[PDB]
Design a protein around this ligand. Sequence first.
Ligand SMILES: *[C@H](C)[C@H]1/C(=C/c2[nH]c(/C=C3N=C(/C=C4\NC(=O)C(CC)=C4C)C(C)=C\3CCC(=O)O)c(CCC(=O)O)c2C)NC(=O)[C@@H]1C
Ligand SMILES: *[C@H](C)[C@H]1/C(=C/c2[nH]c(/C=C3N=C(/C=C4\NC(=O)C(CC)=C4C)C(C)=C\3CCC(=O)O)c(CCC(=O)O)c2C)NC(=O)[C@@H]1C
Ligand SMILES: *[C@H](C)[C@H]1/C(=C/c2[nH]c(/C=C3N=C(/C=C4\NC(=O)C(CC)=C4C)C(C)=C\3CCC(=O)O)c(CCC(=O)O)c2C)NC(=O)[C@@H]1C
Ligand SMILES: *[C@H](C)[C@H]1/C(=C/c2[nH]c(/C=C3N=C(/C=C4\NC(=O)C(CC)=C4C)C(C)=C\3CCC(=O)O)c(CCC(=O)O)c2C)NC(=O)[C@@H]1C
Ligand SMILES: *[C@H](C)[C@H]1/C(=C/c2[nH]c(/C=C3N=C(/C=C4\NC(=O)C(CC)=C4C)C(C)=C\3CCC(=O)O)c(CCC(=O)O)c2C)NC(=O)[C@@H]1C
Ligand SMILES: *[C@H](C)[C@H]1/C(=C/c2[nH]c(/C=C3N=C(/C=C4\NC(=O)C(CC)=C4C)C(C)=C\3CCC(=O)O)c(CCC(=O)O)c2C)NC(=O)[C@@H]1C
Ligand SMILES: *[C@H](C)[C@H]1/C(=C/c2[nH]c(/C=C3N=C(/C=C4\NC(=O)C(CC)=C4C)C(C)=C\3CCC(=O)O)c(CCC(=O)O)c2C)NC(=O)[C@@H]1C
Ligand SMILES: *[C@H](C)[C@H]1/C(=C/c2[nH]c(/C=C3N=C(/C=C4\NC(=O)C(CC)=C4C)C(C)=C\3CCC(=O)O)c(CCC(=O)O)c2C)NC(=O)[C@@H]1C
Ligand SMILES: *[C@H](C)[C@H]1/C(=C/c2[nH]c(/C=C3N=C(/C=C4\NC(=O)C(CC)=C4C)C(C)=C\3CCC(=O)O)c(CCC(=O)O)c2C)NC(=O)[C@@H]1C
Lengths: 647, 160, 161, 161, 161, 67, 160
Amino acid sequence: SVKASGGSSLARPQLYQTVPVSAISQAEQQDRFLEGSELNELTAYFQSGALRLEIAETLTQNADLIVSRAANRIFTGGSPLSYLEPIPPGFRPINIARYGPSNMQKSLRDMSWFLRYTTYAIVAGDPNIIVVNTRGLKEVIENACSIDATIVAIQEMRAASADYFRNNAQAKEIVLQYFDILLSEFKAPTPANKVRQGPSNDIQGLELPQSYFNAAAKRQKYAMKPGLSALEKNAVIKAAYRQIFERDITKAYSQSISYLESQVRNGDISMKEFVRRLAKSPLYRKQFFEPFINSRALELAFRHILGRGPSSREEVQKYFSIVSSGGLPALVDALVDSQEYADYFGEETVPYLRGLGVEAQECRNWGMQQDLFSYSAPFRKVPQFITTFAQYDRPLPDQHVYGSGNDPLEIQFGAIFPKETRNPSKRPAPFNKDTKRILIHRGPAVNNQVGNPSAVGEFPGSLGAKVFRLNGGLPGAKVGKNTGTSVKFGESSTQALIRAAYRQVFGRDLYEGQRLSVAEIQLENGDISVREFIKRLAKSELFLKLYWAPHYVCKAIEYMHRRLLGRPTYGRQEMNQYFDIASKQGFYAVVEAMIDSKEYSDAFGEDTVPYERYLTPGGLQMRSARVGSLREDIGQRVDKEVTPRFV
Amino acid sequence: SVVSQVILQADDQLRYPTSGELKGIQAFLTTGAQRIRIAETLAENEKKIVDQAQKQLFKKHPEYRAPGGNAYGQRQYNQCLRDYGWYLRLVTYGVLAGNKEPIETTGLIGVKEMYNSLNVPVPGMVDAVTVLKDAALGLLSAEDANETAPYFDYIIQFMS
Amino acid sequence: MQDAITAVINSADVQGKYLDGAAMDKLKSYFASGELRVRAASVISANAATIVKEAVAKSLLYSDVTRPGGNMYTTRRYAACIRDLDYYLRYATYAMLAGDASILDERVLNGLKETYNSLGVPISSTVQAIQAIKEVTASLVGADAGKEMGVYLDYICSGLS
Amino acid sequence: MQDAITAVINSADVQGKYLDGAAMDKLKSYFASGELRVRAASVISANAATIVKEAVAKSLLYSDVTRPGGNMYTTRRYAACIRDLDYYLRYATYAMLAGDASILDERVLNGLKETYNSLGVPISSTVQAIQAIKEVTASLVGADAGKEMGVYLDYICSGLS
Amino acid sequence: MQDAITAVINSADVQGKYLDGAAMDKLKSYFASGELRVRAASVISANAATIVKEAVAKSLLYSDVTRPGGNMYTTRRYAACIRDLDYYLRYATYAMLAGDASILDERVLNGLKETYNSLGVPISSTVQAIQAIKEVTASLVGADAGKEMGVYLDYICSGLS
Amino acid sequence: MRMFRITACVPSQTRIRTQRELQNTYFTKLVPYDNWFREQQRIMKMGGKIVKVELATGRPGTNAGLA
Amino acid sequence: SIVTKSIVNADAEARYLSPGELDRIKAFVTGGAARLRIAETLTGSRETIVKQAGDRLFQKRPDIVSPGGNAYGEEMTATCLRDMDYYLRLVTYGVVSGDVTPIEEIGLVGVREMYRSLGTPIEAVAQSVREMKEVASGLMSSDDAAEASAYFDFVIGKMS
Ligand SMILES: *[C@H](C)[C@H]1/C(=C/c2[nH]c(/C=C3N=C(/C=C4\NC(=O)C(CC)=C4C)C(C)=C\3CCC(=O)O)c(CCC(=O)O)c2C)NC(=O)[C@@H]1C
Ligand SMILES: *[C@H](C)[C@H]1/C(=C/c2[nH]c(/C=C3N=C(/C=C4\NC(=O)C(CC)=C4C)C(C)=C\3CCC(=O)O)c(CCC(=O)O)c2C)NC(=O)[C@@H]1C
Ligand SMILES: *[C@H](C)[C@H]1/C(=C/c2[nH]c(/C=C3N=C(/C=C4\NC(=O)C(CC)=C4C)C(C)=C\3CCC(=O)O)c(CCC(=O)O)c2C)NC(=O)[C@@H]1C
Ligand SMILES: *[C@H](C)[C@H]1/C(=C/c2[nH]c(/C=C3N=C(/C=C4\NC(=O)C(CC)=C4C)C(C)=C\3CCC(=O)O)c(CCC(=O)O)c2C)NC(=O)[C@@H]1C
Ligand SMILES: *[C@H](C)[C@H]1/C(=C/c2[nH]c(/C=C3N=C(/C=C4\NC(=O)C(CC)=C4C)C(C)=C\3CCC(=O)O)c(CCC(=O)O)c2C)NC(=O)[C@@H]1C
Ligand SMILES: *[C@H](C)[C@H]1/C(=C/c2[nH]c(/C=C3N=C(/C=C4\NC(=O)C(CC)=C4C)C(C)=C\3CCC(=O)O)c(CCC(=O)O)c2C)NC(=O)[C@@H]1C
Ligand SMILES: *[C@H](C)[C@H]1/C(=C/c2[nH]c(/C=C3N=C(/C=C4\NC(=O)C(CC)=C4C)C(C)=C\3CCC(=O)O)c(CCC(=O)O)c2C)NC(=O)[C@@H]1C
Ligand SMILES: *[C@H](C)[C@H]1/C(=C/c2[nH]c(/C=C3N=C(/C=C4\NC(=O)C(CC)=C4C)C(C)=C\3CCC(=O)O)c(CCC(=O)O)c2C)NC(=O)[C@@H]1C
Ligand SMILES: *[C@H](C)[C@H]1/C(=C/c2[nH]c(/C=C3N=C(/C=C4\NC(=O)C(CC)=C4C)C(C)=C\3CCC(=O)O)c(CCC(=O)O)c2C)NC(=O)[C@@H]1C
């Protein structure tokens, strides 16, 4: 399996274009309200739509009759309708028995599905659904189906739909032209596939059929020609600002460089030269270079100029070396004066975001580019490309099975988790079921249960956390100290145990009206053991309110396991177990399961208060990789400082 | 040529041709005596190859000669043998240079929309190359055929 | 770019005058023949591949250009020319919808004369190829629409020549 | 680029005919002298930095151009001329390897002649520098390949002038 | 761009000699007038819109250009002329601060003559607009600073003509 | 900053395969001096033909004061 | 116009106008006689609207005609009467075109910095069009004025 995941954000491909879709998206890409044009697109469609309902309603009802009259004309030698699911060029009627039942079932359903897609075409009001699904169909159907028989079948249906309807010339012509498009697209052979050639050796070459880029909403492409009237020239410049700055900033804040605008309006500098000068401008520098790391600003510079994310590990490595050498100008210069930029946009065309629909996509930087094309990209300040690309070659990282966000910070108190929304730093990794996470023991390294399972109930001797035990006799256990004995020495020890037992369940010491006084005195009397006392504090409504309720279910399970057992979960096997209990039984039973677990009983007895036994490598790094606490012999060469021989 | 492909790849990285790149040239220049031999046996023996290729095509595809076809006229039928003669000409250019580039630039780059605008089927011409391949390699000797084989196969790939 | 209605605004705008009777009657003509402009463009849109196909058939096919030595021989060159003729057709289709010839000079005829001279494209054959479209398109849309179609197609070839 | 092997191919492509014995004799010459070209390229590749220096010291250094007033005085312009001559040798190696001076017509002499007139780069001083390159590369490789190398370096000299 | 300091440095570097007393007097002249140049630039920056305000009013407004059929009729073109004259003021302020007319020759008068001929912008009325600026800018800061700006504005006048 | 008034046609080699829209390959633009070496090399590698180049911005043979 | 917005968007999409887009052009052309009727009434009483809303502007905003303002005597008053005459002409151009294109191209682009250089307040010239909308709506029928006001409020909104 793969060791890294870039993310799997929802992809929404446009299967076919409708009139409302074509109208709305036209102004959406331009970042405008629907003007007198785009409103009139809808107005004429909504008026005709009532008639377009009557087209389909007749054709949906009489669908059985159209396909029956078609199949009878085409297929000879029996009845084709036994197993229902004008210009002849030179067709020969196909025998029913000779063609075979399996081929006949295909033939019949396609004839119905051709008419079905015609009815959808009128209702949509755009023959896009036809153009896509009919263009590259002649070639694939040629193998085991005659083309000559299909043309006359559609032409029969054209006449069949004409005679059955026949209302008005303003009504029937919609039926006629859509059928006329249908036969013309079917007569047309399969066009050449769109070949996305790799710009260098590092990036793979791709191919996309001439059907996928026929529906998936074409990105509006603006080119600065010197003769254009200044209204559409303004539309080009606004689009150029919408590409570089992700949004129209000249409308928002009136932030515009008129010095550069004037030169492009004339034709002194090209759009290639404009993008160059605009991306090295202090206006871009402040917004997409200054707030970001060198790696992330590089990743943003890719989508602004080239209109795509970095494709390969080698590409990020190359372009980071450029931005380290000469900075932002040198990076911009490398991006504009590339073989890719001049191939896609040339000199005149404004850069555009080439995503799922525009071109063929590679299976490498899918989710990394999906989040990048979003407007929420310049808030993810953690790089997504260089992180995933490096993690691809490496094995599985030190991470919780349900992501990096599921890992809490290894602190004394407070369940603090990285938020998915606030500062996107989600790092998915394909963890399987039987994947045990390597955990660092607080005590001796030999006392790890992975290598030494017998030494699970061994106390950390001044290496890890302090162990609290009810070793000493509880006050008022035996009737030796009769009535009096005001100075019973064994009283402060059990109270310190209670406080520590509170400190383990809830990281911090609680307030006055939060302490369970009933549970405390039962432990002090010797009615319940520590195991029962820890269980009661974790079964408290306060623990539910503070740690369980405000947090994500599996985050709350993970933190509870780090508090009750003092250990992060090894992997899926344990996490799925408690998550199954959380679904069926509830929170209280999850508490019960973690206490009544065998590993709890082995590590901590009936008198032992739980403690931090194991840390995550990331957690220990936070503790012992700071300026202090770090030893000299961790990751540094130690030279023996000896007095010189001349001294 | 493979000579051009090396110096393109070297210029792309802005460097001189490498040790393995120069040896790739060295290997081609030695086997150039065989490359010359490919040309003569196909150019002079064109009339036998072209006639065998066309008779096998129109037998397997009796549609273009049939009513409502593509090549019904005698001037149209000569154009089908013209293409056959041009493709085998392109094969010779490819082998001699050593790579697909001569075939690529002349008769592969944008070849689908070529015959789309002439109503000639590309799935019909993908079967035309195969019978031309079968006729050519049959006349060629055993060790000579295996050299000329993958050049024909690339044309098949780009068609359909 | 402008239209037939936008040009009559701009011609009255330079004088700084309201829409007079000489401007109003020119507004009538385009508004009456506008329905004829829509229908013919819809026919062209549906049969976009056919006109280009038939234009080459009676001009460039079985000719000196397609024979080796010209600029129509290779499949790289041939596919480029039919792409151009498709574009020349498309921008002409926009021209008749607008009722303005300045759209040709706008996007197409910016410097397509001199860029053809740079690559060594024969102009005389290209003009004849443009002329070939006129006969095919007029038979498809009609004599009334084809004459209106012919003007903008003539505007393409005249600037190239 | 157009190699010497592809030169006879492209010439036959324009003619639309097969390669004759009067055309393949030039190809046979390329196949025979090909092993000489590779070894010549291997020597130049290894000693790429040294050829430049031995040419600059012979012609350019201790002259009026390197002294104040000249175009090769400032370090910025000095590094430019060193860069230029590095590209001049590298592309001459390509033409030597390909066997044709088409790459010098395409990827060298495209607009190089006019840029040098724009900046005010001395044409006579550049020719002298390439002539200095010619004499060094002939001494390093040999008289057999260096004379062949000298043809392509003459093409740059005739191209600049 | 070359300022008054760098112009002396460049001239000395061409000959390749140290800064002598014949060249240092030019530097001494700039450092003495430096207080006058900065103080003037502060006044121009203060009244950046105010200089343009009066200049257009006394020359361009109530004329043939602002009237329909002119080049200052449309608000788009009007704002462009306002945009132009603030560049003619800002870069002249840059030239005053620099102490050399190198900035105006490269970033303003690059192809400004060719631009004004192509679009149909009247040069004669533009010259009058610069002369309108000159008279306003002189009677705002002083006679000495006004004639300093006047020289750089005359460079714009001579450049456009 | 010195700028070159450059005039070059750069025909697309992949336009047929990529199936992208037609762009005006002939352009007269100003290009910075620091970028011109990378610009010129890019054009002539695509098989583009350079027509006319003019030093519009700057003085020929300048030592000090460029940008 | 609507027909300009068709082609510009079609070239951006690099494809022919769709039947949905063609239905818009159909509706605009057929409904072109109705929109021409709007301009005919406005060009007829062009003196009436500008004068009536002119005195309304001096009534509602006295500060304009009052000492200190832009309007002084008759010579500065006539220019304000000329400006309102220009904008009413601009409305009629946008009325016949069916779109807000000729309003923008002639007199709306950089309108803020246009009146900044003159010293005219932008909200005052917005108020003049507001009053011009009110008088024009009272002259013709209400249903007819609904289309007319839509181009009027565009002039107001950008100068607001
Ligand atoms: C040296 C002290 C130790 C070390 C460094 C090391 N770094 C890399 C590679 C990268 N460096 C970075 C980090 C940064 N990106 C930023 O934005 C910033 C802040 C301005 C920095 C410092 C990144 C993202 C990379 C990746 C780019 C690349 O591939 O070079 C390496 C190379 C590792 C590799 O080849 O994958 C190294 C070695 N590591 C050590 O061993 C030293 C102790
Ligand atoms: C007081 C100076 C300012 C302040 C404090 C404040 N803190 C919290 C809550 C928490 N404090 C911590 C931090 C720590 N965890 C550790 O391990 C240590 C070191 C031993 C510390 C100090 C944590 C984890 C929390 C979260 C909840 C908890 O108590 O476990 C709050 C409440 C925040 C909330 O909304 O819940 C506050 C207000 N804030 C101010 O306004 C003072 C300037
Ligand atoms: C010996 C080859 C080198 C070396 C080893 C070293 N390791 C540690 C500490 C730990 N080792 C591990 C790793 C694992 N536990 C697992 O579950 C697995 C997978 C099966 C492995 C390999 C862990 C978790 C620790 C932390 C302590 C613990 O046992 O929980 C140390 C001590 C580090 C310290 O400072 O505490 C050392 C020295 N180092 C060398 O010098 C050798 C080259
Ligand atoms: C025969 C195998 C099939 C066939 C052929 C056929 N082709 C055409 C049209 C043309 N084919 C070419 C040839 C080429 N273009 C290139 O670039 C190359 C590589 C160098 C080749 C081989 C060209 C340019 C044309 C058009 C030129 C002309 O018409 O003279 C036709 C004519 C179309 C028609 O019917 O009018 C034909 C018949 N036809 C089949 O059905 C066979 C499968
Ligand atoms: C066909 C009628 C003749 C022909 C055409 C031909 N032209 C070129 C070169 C190009 N033409 C274009 C296309 C356009 N540029 C534009 O801006 C427009 C308007 C929208 C058009 C139509 C371009 C850009 C090129 C350059 C190549 C590219 O695709 O980028 C060629 C190719 C020349 C070559 O060998 O490179 C051809 C073949 N030539 C003929 O022989 C016909 C008579
Ligand atoms: C002395 C500090 C070290 C040294 C000097 C050395 N330099 C050269 C060669 C040249 N030096 C230059 C460089 C410049 N010319 C300029 O215009 C500038 C910037 C203002 C400089 C610094 C040049 C052009 C030459 C070429 C000589 C010529 O006049 O044509 C040499 C000679 C190298 C040789 O053997 O050919 C030497 C010795 N070298 C050392 O060892 C010292 C540490
Ligand atoms: C050295 C032989 C002589 C010399 C050179 C010199 N050249 C420049 C400037 C440039 N040279 C080029 C030319 C090329 N671009 C290409 O594509 C090729 C072919 C591979 C070449 C050689 C370019 C583009 C420049 C501009 C520099 C840049 O970085 O863009 C200079 C500098 C000119 C100046 O005044 O700044 C010089 C000095 N001149 C001499 O004196 C030598 C005789
Ligand atoms: C006002 C004094 C006169 C006037 C001006 C006018 N200019 C244009 C168009 C342009 N103005 C420039 C000039 C500059 N842009 C720069 O970058 C610089 C240097 C900092 C300057 C001075 C350019 C390049 C253009 C063309 C592109 C653009 O419009 O910005 C117009 C518009 C012309 C048109 O119709 O497109 C106008 C009106 N016109 C007059 O009548 C005044 C006397
Ligand atoms: C009246 C509604 C308000 C007003 C008007 C006012 N305008 C000016 C001066 C000018 N107004 C324009 C505007 C245009 N003229 C055009 O050609 C166009 C495009 C169709 C427009 C919109 C211009 C350019 C001028 C200059 C005069 C000229 O044409 O030469 C003034 C005079 C300002 C002065 O003192 O110079 C006035 C008073 N001002 C208000 O306060 C009213 C609310």
